[PDB]
Amino acid sequence: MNIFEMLRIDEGLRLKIYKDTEGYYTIGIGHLLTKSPSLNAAKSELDKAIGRNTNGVITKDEAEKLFNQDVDAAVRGILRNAKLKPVYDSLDAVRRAAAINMVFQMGETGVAGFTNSLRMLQQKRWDEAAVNLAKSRWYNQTPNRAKRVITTFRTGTWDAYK
Numbered sequence: 001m002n003i004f005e006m007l008r009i010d011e012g013l014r015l016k017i018y019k020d021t022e023g024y025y026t027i028g029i030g031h032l033l034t035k036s037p038s039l040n041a042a043k044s045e046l047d048k049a050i051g052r053n054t055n056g057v058i059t060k061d062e063a064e065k066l067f068n069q070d071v072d073a074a075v076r077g078i079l080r081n082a083k084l085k086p087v088y089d090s091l092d093a094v095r096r097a098a099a100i101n102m103v104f105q106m107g108e109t110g111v112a113g114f115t116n117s118l119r120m121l122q123q124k125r126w127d128e129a130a131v132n133l134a135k136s137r138w139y140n141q142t143p144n145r146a147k148r149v150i151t152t153f154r155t156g157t158w159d160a161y162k
């Protein structure tokens with residue numbers, strides 16, 4: 001397992017524009033197009049992203065391309081965030097994949113607000129971090145996914161994804 005297979009499992013793959021768990025237009029592997037309620041707006045942002053008139057539909061390769069850019073962007077975001085980087089550099093490889101998953105889902109911003117959890121992770125207090133992580137709107141809204149990521153930070157293994 002790795003970061004790509006992990007997010008491919010949590011996000012799925014859809015080749016036509018769809019609405020995500022929050023009702024926002026998305027496509028591919030969890031690639032958010034816009035928070036706007038306008039489908040047109042979404043179609044415009046997709047065309048701009050792909051570089052052609054897609055008419056709301058993309059191929060597998062194109063979805064995979066957006067995905068690669070999105071993961072890379074997520075890592076880069078972490079390394080650029082002063083609150084995130086130190087945590088991230090302190091973790092082992094498996095747990096770093098968990099941190100990337102969260103950033104991919106909720107943004108650098110969103111994750112950087114889990115102050116207390118971040119500090120517990122930095123201290124390697126796994127069980128405590130796992131309990132604090134679950135006290136969040138994130139866990140109550142997407143509990144199955146949150147549980148998989150949480151177990152990942154807790155154990156340092158990929159058992160939740162096997």
Ligand SMILES: [Ar]
Binds near residue numbers: 085088099
């Ligand atoms: Ar992080």
Ligand SMILES: [Cl-]
Binds near residue numbers: 049
């Ligand atoms: Cl883009």
Ligand SMILES: [Cl-]
Binds near residue numbers: 143145
């Ligand atoms: Cl879920």
